[PDB]
Symmetry: C2
Subunit: 312 residues, 2 copies
């Protein structure tokens, strides 16, 4: 009766719970969940939604290893049996539409960066819609209605491609390590810009000097290979990923004739930096004809999408 749905990845579980407005039972349940969370201590409450009717919504994440403890209290779930599975993407969609239709407590679930500061975007009649899911790789979904959507393409250069490389480039233990490393790096030391070839704008084919002519182009020169810092390659690594994703997304929006491109995925959660670089990139490839949109509950959509398949 306490309604909920879990997003089970290979390292983490994302979960949404509906707190109805018995009382003692939920409380004691809440008390020992407080135990475990304060164990972990050695923004999830920011995204709580109140006074919403559903025929509160709380949002939490915790290691998959912590999950079996709750019994006494996607890709990951098949190996945790050690329930009925549901397609992450189907749950991503159903979940996404719901929250965006219900708003964020009278504020907007969808937003973008104006240029840069963040600003909202009414997305209440969202069809059609281009959803770019960035996990280890990227899958692009063209959504036409609540009951129709399909994966029209993808790229193998996603999150697993960035951390995968930076770990090889930097010895970085974790993702946020690479992020904050990237956050301090400068890509131009690694990549070759347009002006690195022509001295300036390639005006003939409408190319500015500041565009990236070659990812890691300057790393063919041992001179500059010794001269590049860990953080730059961390930075250099992420730039390429984002720029390529923006390019594919833009080409997709053109072919599928969709003007709204929202980015999601477990990859977008820890830092807004990932988000901004996509925003700059989609801006460049669509030449401003496309804005990038993002969601505040990015990461729990699968979780809630699982919540609404509940059988009664």
């Amino acid at each position: 009766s306490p309604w909920f749905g879990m997003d089970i990845g290979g390292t983490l579980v994302k979960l949404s719970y509906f707190e109805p407005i018995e009382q003692e039972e939920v409380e004691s349940l809440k008390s020992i969940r407080k135990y475990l969370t304060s164990n972990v201590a050695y923004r999830d409450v920011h995204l709580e939604l109140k006074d919403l009717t559903l025929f509160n919504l709380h949002f939490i994440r915790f290691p998959t290893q912590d999950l079996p403890t709750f019994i006494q209290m996607g890709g990951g779930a098949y190996k945790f049996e050690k329930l009925h599975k549901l397609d992450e993407l189907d749950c991503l969609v159903k979940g996404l539409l719901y929250i965006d239709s219900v708003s964020f407590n009278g504020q907007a679930e969808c937003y973008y960066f104006a240029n840069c500061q963040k600003m909202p975007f009414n997305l209440d009649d969202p069809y059609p819609l281009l959803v770019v899911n960035i996990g280890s790789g990227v899958s692009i979904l063209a959504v036409h209605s609540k009951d129709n959507y399909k994966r029209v393409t993808g790229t193998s250069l996603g999150g697993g491609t960035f951390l995968g490389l930076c770990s090889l480039l930097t010895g970085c233990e974790s993702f946020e390590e690479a992020l904050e490393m990237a956050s301090k790096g400068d890509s131009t030391q690694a990549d070759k810009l347009v002006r690195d070839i022509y001295g300036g704008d390639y005006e003939r084919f409408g190319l500015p000097g500041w565009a990236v002519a070659s990812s890691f182009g300057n790393m063919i020169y041992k001179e500059k290979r010794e001269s590049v810092s860990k953080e730059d390659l961390a930075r250099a690594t992420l730039v390429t990923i984002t720029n390529n994703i923006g390019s594919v997304a833009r080409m997709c929006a053109v072919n599928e004739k969709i003007n709204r491109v929202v980015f999601v995925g477990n990859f977008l959660r820890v830092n807004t930096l990932s988000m901004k670089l996509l925003a700059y990139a989609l801006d460049y490839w669509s030449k401003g004809q496309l804005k990038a949109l993002f969601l505040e509950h990015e990461g729990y959509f699968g979780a809630v999408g699982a919540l609404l398949g509940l059988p009664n």
Copy 2:
């Protein structure tokens, strides 16, 4: 009067010469060019073209440093002044059309891989045409006629991106080192395949298990990080590049409604392996609706494109 046009890059010069059918002067010129080439000794003659009227064509390459010696006998030319420049791409186009219109001594200048072995392709009415130029980066040209064409997009992941990385991944001194390294590597040790997530085909969104889910996806696991050989990453590096290029090219062919996609660039010269991986990739993204085409004089087109701007 001995007509010729040079392609001057930052490391090499590509040059085409028209041997008309005086005789002593060309001979002695030829003799001391034989000197220098036999100095270097410490397929260019295969591409010679004979009995062609032009209102023989010989094809040669040599280090830019060797060039000034000939006086007594693109990007690179501006720094060699130490003539009138001409846009490499304009010369690429003019050069390409010419040779493909004139055939290859009664054999085909254009070919593709049948599936894999190589087989020819009549390309005598080539408009429209998608030319994918892979240098340090990739520029895609949509050609509509001999006098009309424009760069419709590009990607920053080209040759400079591959050697750039492998050098950082492998300590490889040169390109052919990385190539033959790649030639011995296996990418699956680095990248995460579809089946690495679902155990098999993702049949729901029509995804086979053997597709690459994440470039270097398996390199987030230190286990597999120690377990990957230099050659695989060399291999792993090239796969991603080719697959991304095929994807962009395919999306471009769709939007520009061109069915013929030919690949060129200094990057395609040393090995057919680069070529085959593009052929497999364009095959996958267009689902066989597109074949990849290649040229036998790939690399001298700029050179000859410069030959036909000669003023008289």
